[PDB]
PDB file of C-alpha atoms in Angstrom:
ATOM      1  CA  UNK A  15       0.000   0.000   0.000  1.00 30.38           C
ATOM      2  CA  UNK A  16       1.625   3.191  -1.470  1.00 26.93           C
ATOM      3  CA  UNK A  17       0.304   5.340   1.593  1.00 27.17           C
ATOM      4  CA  UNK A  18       0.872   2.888   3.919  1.00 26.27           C
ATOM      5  CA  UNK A  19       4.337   3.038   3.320  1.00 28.53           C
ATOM      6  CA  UNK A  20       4.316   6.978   2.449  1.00 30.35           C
ATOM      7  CA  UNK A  21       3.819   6.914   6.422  1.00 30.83           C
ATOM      8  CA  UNK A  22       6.927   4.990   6.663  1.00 30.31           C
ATOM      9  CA  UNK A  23       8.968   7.376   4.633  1.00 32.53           C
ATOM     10  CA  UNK A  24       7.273  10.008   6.508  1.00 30.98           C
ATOM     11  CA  UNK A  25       8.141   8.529  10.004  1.00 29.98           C
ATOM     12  CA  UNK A  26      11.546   6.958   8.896  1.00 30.91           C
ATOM     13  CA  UNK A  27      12.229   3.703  10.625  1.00 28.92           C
ATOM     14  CA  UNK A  28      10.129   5.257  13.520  1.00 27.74           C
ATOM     15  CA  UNK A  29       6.341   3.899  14.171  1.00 30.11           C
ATOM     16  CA  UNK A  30       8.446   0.307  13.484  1.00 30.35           C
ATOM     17  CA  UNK A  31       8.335   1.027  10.214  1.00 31.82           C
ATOM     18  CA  UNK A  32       4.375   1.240  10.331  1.00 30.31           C
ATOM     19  CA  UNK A  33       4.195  -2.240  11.619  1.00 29.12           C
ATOM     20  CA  UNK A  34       6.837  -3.354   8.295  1.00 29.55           C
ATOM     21  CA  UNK A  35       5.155  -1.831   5.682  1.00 29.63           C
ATOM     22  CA  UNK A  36       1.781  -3.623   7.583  1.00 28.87           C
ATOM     23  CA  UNK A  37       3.487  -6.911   7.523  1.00 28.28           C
ATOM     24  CA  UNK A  38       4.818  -6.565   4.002  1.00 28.10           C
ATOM     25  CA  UNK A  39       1.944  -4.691   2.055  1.00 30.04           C
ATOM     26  CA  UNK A  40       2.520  -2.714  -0.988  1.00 30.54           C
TER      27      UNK A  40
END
């Protein structure tokens, strides 16, 4: 999920990554 892991970019490696990209989604 794109936004999903726009969070991720957004929080860094903080937020655990946003739980691993949700448990490896796109």
């Amino acid at each position: 999920n794109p936004e999903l892991q726009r969070k991720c970019k957004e929080l860094x490696t903080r937020x655990x990554x946003x739980x691993x990209x949700x448990x490896x989604s796109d």
